A paper describes a structure:
One widely occurring ribonuclease with such multi-functional versatility is polynucleotide phosphorylase, a phosphorolytic exoribonuclease (PNPase; polyribonucleotide nucleotidyltransferase; EC 2.7.7.8).5,6 PNPase processively cleaves single-stranded RNA substrates in the 3′-to-5′ direction using inorganic phosphate to attack the phosphoester linkage at the 3′ terminus and liberate nucleoside diphosphate. E. coli PNPase core forms a homotrimer with a ring-like architecture that encloses a large central channel. The two RNase PH-like domains within each protomer are spatially related by a pseudo-dyad axis, so that the PNPase trimer has approximate dihedral symmetry D3. In the current study, we solved several crystal structures of E. coli PNPase core bound to its cognate RNase E micro-domain, including a complex with O2′-methyl-modified RNA bound and another with manganese in the active site.
We find that Mn2+can substitute for Mg2+to support catalysis (S.N. et al., unpublished results), and since Mn2+can be more readily identified in difference maps and anomalous Fourier syntheses, we prepared RNA-free co-crystals of the PNPase core in the presence of 20 mM manganese acetate. In this crystal form, a single protomer occupies the asymmetric unit, and the map revealed clear density for Mn2+at the active site. Mn2+is coordinated by the conserved residues D486, D492 and K494 (inset), and it is likely that magnesium will bind in a similar manner. The metal-coordinating residues D486 and D492 may act in conjunction with the bound metal to support general acid/base catalysis. The RNase E micro-domain is also well resolved in the rhombohedral crystal form with Mn2+ but was poorly resolved in the second rhombohedral form grown in the absence of the metal. Guided by this overlay, a model for the transition state of an RNA substrate under attack by PNPase was prepared. Lastly, we docked the chimeric RNA structure from the P. abyssi exosome structures onto the corresponding position in our PNPase core-manganese structure. The overlay shows that the metal is in a good position to support the proposed transition state. The metal is well orientated to interact with the carboxylates of D486 and D492, and the pro-chiral, non-esterified oxygens that are in the axial position of the bi-pyrimidal transition state. In the RNA-free structure, the metal is coordinated by water molecules at the positions that correspond to the phosphate oxygens in the transition state.
Author numbering:
A (entry chain A), C (entry chain A), E (entry chain A): 1 to 77, 83 to 246, 261 to 267, 297 to 358, 374 to 545
B (entry chain D), D (entry chain D), F (entry chain D): 1039 to 1059
């Protein structure tokens, strides 16, 4: 006999249905999530025992859309770019919630079984993974909420439909727990810092009903929590022990950098907390392409090209191994290229001219020749210069930067233009792209609690000045498209 | 004619600087 | 100087030519097989020495059709689904003939060099592998025969042509040695148990001339038999030592189960030898698809969907890692998905309506959410309910089951609805699919001698009742297509 | 409206049983 | 501040620009090479430390053409066949220049950023790799030159354009250092031995200006040479210690063969220095194909087919694992198939009939059933017989052979029809294909200095007789296309 | 009819030989 445990709740203009304890019973947990007519079957399998010599935590999130979900039969057609991006939209918020030291293999599989053309399955899958990981018993400090925030008629809209996104000046996706925001992925039409930040708070407050309803479902049908504890801290072994290529467990060396930044001492390369690296802006680097640009920000360089033809706006991103001075594979999008490429696309999509004024298919290819701090934001700067070189009449010039944060108690330091080493060690990756008048793209990845409205407001303010500084240098080289 | 940084039509550079308030 | 050893023989309405000892001389053996105008060049390479810490026997059968075989040049086109299925039609009968303990790496490569549009290369390749493995000297308890059995005008037809298959009510492929039948793969138009069984005996008796002619070719051109013997049985170490997920070398634990079944004691889960697991039949599970069905047979569950469009009948089969409570890859057809998918397709193809009465392209996708005993037969049950939900006017409802056999001397036990653990330990995998009036699909995989007409007749009779029981439960939910 | 086993239009279930002769 | 080091020089009818020390600074070296409007960005990364138990030198050359280079946007489109062949045109000359014992991982990545439709990027990429490897500091006994040699109006043309190649009777690509020639890859319209050899000398003398200009660039912007030395020769362990399948560190056993050949003693299989293996020529092997041929040269056999249809001349080359008596993968072009296939294509392309006289698409597929010495040249022989079997009116019959050279001081031995074992041990791989009147294809791979005009002239003369001998046997079977 | 080396229409063979000067 099969017994389905069902909980329904109102979420904006939709009803979210959660079913468990019936389908896929050999999985650690499995939920059928339905937001109106769109449905995603999410499963989580966590291995009971960790492997002997495991150095990292293996988390694999698999997203897959079925053709039968829309009621279609495939023609002449390995996950697509859209499926990989949504898989990362699930992976990013859930990853830092597994306790420090947890090494067991966990796999999340989300498959779309039904889809309404107006309701996007990406939010449905994120709620499904949040429900499954909480019902499983696997140590997971959730549950998380998922909310898409629009901006129609100067007002924030919770989970706007595909038709409502046409009127919206914002496509922000926010994820986080009851305590603090974890992820943020968005695209905007040059909105101010307060408008962008207000959207993060709006979505985080609205997604609380999702967290509350998963919690109650765990109280009713949740499997007993995994009896797990990390290997105890041994003090006997702990207390006993400018250029990136020249400089680069050393947990103590990682601590020294963190303690130096909080004290107010110069950074690893010698810069201050708000200083930007050496800039080099160039236009017309390649003779046979329509537009070419070579943007350099310290030890981060991008060779960006623009091609005109007769999707209307294509963006490609290449990350070769020689950018970091290493020998790897080529052509294979290492769980990065698709993510950073769409990030750089969202930073440029706002200033792109209308098809009525400029009826041409534009493809932008970014080549990362050097990487030492956010090559995705360097691609945003390079794209703007390459489009102006090609003769593409973009509304305004666009630049991007990456921001870092080290927080200790109530003492926090906002870092401008973070390095490769400064990423791994910070508590918050913070990428802002936009023009002199607004923000086109905003990305957040937070791992700590205590991150509030004010701290994020100061972080955006220092990011705005960092953006305006590069835009000033960019204007000195080129300021108008052919 | 040629490719690279030397053949660039437009150029602008700046030393590591603190942005304006 | 090259000298070809040639033996020709009559096989039905064709002449089968076997050439060896001339082409590909660095291979352990190599035959050029020609049934009339269709030719497949089959090669076998067996490694002389086994690897140090090898736990299993590595057998790889590679089938490949060349475009020049039909006299064609490729247009805009990794083995296809048809090439993978035929590779398994060669792999299945040859695998259990290698002596128990043989661990050396053996690879069979069959390439089609010529093809008659009427004579199917699949039987030609199976004879070629049978000839090559026997001439090689590699320990192989063959040779095996290969026969396609049709059913035209109430009579069995040996190796029917593609035009004769249009009139035939059967497409049975049988393989086995001189002693007993090993494999069976078929598709039928609702034929009785005696009609299906008679076809297996007919084909096995007709393929004896193939075995006799390979034997004579081995007497003339066969390489000296490999001087091989397994590592001796050490008694010093041998004599010294309901839910599937909760319960699951232990050769003794494997023996305990076998001895329990033969004695007449309840099975691992507590069922009797002819009892079927708990059934759950559902219709209309997904809101955005045309037809949906959720079929559950104990701990085996399948989410099956049906899609209508304007090959006419497509069948897709997905086996995700969460079905067994494990963490594996997704999207990659692990040497299963293609095999079980076509098996479930053949079980439903008989009841599918004519294109004159129902002119629509139908795609059926099966999602294995739980697996503990033949998820392919659960897909047959799920497809029938999904088609009736979609409004597809199938001739009759169709269900499937897997059967097992433990034989010891003359004492044998026929097992109904076998578990995942009961497969590995049984001597015969036996899958029957059909309606209340006949058999649509029948699959056999036997590893033992002494398997006769009577024992297989009792096995089918218990399978028929097992099929009728599920069909009765299926009728209680739905009995007519919209 | 919703997806899953609970929203099924038709349903039939049977306990582990021995088939009729 | 970025400072580009630029050196320009005249090369034939073009100006080659080399830029370094600005783009991709974390790579061991990186050059932007531009021959007129065609530009290839070449990078080299060499690892500072070698891996513990490394047995071979890992060199990976990656060539990739960008669609934005020609100013195009991709439609509905893993490196292509053209990209893989050019990658080998870079790999072949650079590989034997790394000192004996060098085991560190080196990767060369060449990406085309701009392309003139008349100037081929393949020569540009070869100069780029030569410049990068010399500027890196990594132990590399270059720099090498790169030259394409044409033959218009009985005169040699340095780097002919795509329009000039239409008039040319030669497409020879030569690479080598200041001292000696290393590689040679060509295609010709039945040119004499002196015409082919003169082209190698012409190109090697013309490419000296490339070597001279890279040297000066190293004097100005070259990184300090890597302080590297191989593990010293230990004498304590050194002084202490017909059929191919039956016969097959043993550096002493490798030395015994080399010393035997130089002395004048019979080869491993028993042949003399100019003797050819046992030949078997057959026509009409497969009944359903248009033309079929089975060519056997000792223990090297090729099943070659020809298909007619209504690129105009397609050539496919398959190298299965059973050809050497091994068990490997199938379908995957192991860094060979594409190389040997185009080699065999270039050997047959000269005698192929005009589209005006014979307006049909011809596809030739070669199946290597046995391999023990240059299966690519056996494919040339097999193709000529298969085309004549199909009824394709080729201008003349074409055959191919592989030649070897052992040199010691001034004593050298030219080997005819080399074995698989005789390749690994020789100093020069030398493949010649052509008719009775000229040479269609010529390939060279030299690893030693002292290789001069006279020695190569004697090597071609012995190759010509070896070619005429097989052509005589080929004529005895078939001499006219249907 | 059949495939292989035996069904070949044309055939020519030669023992290991030294080519003519
Ligand atoms: Mn799932
Ligand atoms: Mn990061
Ligand atoms: Mn074969
Ligand atoms: Mn099985
Ligand atoms: Mn490069
Ligand atoms: Mn070679």
């Amino acid at each position: 006999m099969l017994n389905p445990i069902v909980r329904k709740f109102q979420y904006g203009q939709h009803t979210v249905t959660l079913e468990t304890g019936m389908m896929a019973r050999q999985a650690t947990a499995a939920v059928m999530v339905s937001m109106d007519d769109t449905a995603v079957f999410v499963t989580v399998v966590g291995q009971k025992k960790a492997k002997p010599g495991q150095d990292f935590f293996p988390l694999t999130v698999n997203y897959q859309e079925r053709t039968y979900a829309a009621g279609r039969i495939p023609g002449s057609f390995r996950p697509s770019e859209g499926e990989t991006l949504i898989a990362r939209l699930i992976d990013r918020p859930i990853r830092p919630l597994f306790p420090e030291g947890f090494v067991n293999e966990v796999q999340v599989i989300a498959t779309v079984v039904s889809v309404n053309p107006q309701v996007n399955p990406d939010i449905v899958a994120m709620i499904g993974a949040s429900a499954a990981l909480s019902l499983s018993g696997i140590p997971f400090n959730g549950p998380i909420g998922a909310a898409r925030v629009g901006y129609i008629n100067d007002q924030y809209v919770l989970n706007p439909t595909q038709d409502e996104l046409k009127e919206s000046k914002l496509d922000l996706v926010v994820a986080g727990t009851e305590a603090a925001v974890l992820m943020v992925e968005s695209e905007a039409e040059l909105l101010s810092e307060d408008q962008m930040l207000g959207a993060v708070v709006f979505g985080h407050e609205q997604q609380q009903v999702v967290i509350q309803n998963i919690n109650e479902l765990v109280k009713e049908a949740g499997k007993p929590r995994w009896d797990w504890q990390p290997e105890p801290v041994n003090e006997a072994l702990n207390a006993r022990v400018t250029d990136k290529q020249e400089r680069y467990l050393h947990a103590i060396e990682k601590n020294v950098v963190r303690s130096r930044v909080l004290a107010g001492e110069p950074r690893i390369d010698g810069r201050e907390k708000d200083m930007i690296r050496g800039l080099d802006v160039r236009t017309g680097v390649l003779p046979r392409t329509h537009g070419s640009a070579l943007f350099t920000r310290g030890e981060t360089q991008a060779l960006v090209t623009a091609t005109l033809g007769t999707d209307t706006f294509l963006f490609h991103y290449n990350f070769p191994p020689y950018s970091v001075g290493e020998t790897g594979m080529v052509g294979s999008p290492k769980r990065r290229e698709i993510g950073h490429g769409r990030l750089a696309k969202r930073g440029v999509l706002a200033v792109m001219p209308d098809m009525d004024k400029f009826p041409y298919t534009v493809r932008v290819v970014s080549e990362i020749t050097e990487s030492n701090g956010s090559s995705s934001m360097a691609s945003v700067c390079g794209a703007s210069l390459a489009l102006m070189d090609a003769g593409v009449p973009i509304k305004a010039a666009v630049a991007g930067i990456a921001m870092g944060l080290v927080k200790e108690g109530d003492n926090y330091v906002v870092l401008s233009d973070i390095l490769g080493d400064e990423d791994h060690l910070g508590d918050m990756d913070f990428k802002v792209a936009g023009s002199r008048d607004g923000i086109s793209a905003l990305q957040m990845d937070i791992k700590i609690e205590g991150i509030t409205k004010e701290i994020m407001q100061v972080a955006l303010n220092q990011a705005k000045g960092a953006r305006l500084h590069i835009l000033g240098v960019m204007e000195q080289a080129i300021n108008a498209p052919r | 004619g040629a490719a690279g940084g030397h053949t660039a039509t437009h150029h602008a550079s700046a030393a590591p600087a603190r942005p304006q308030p």
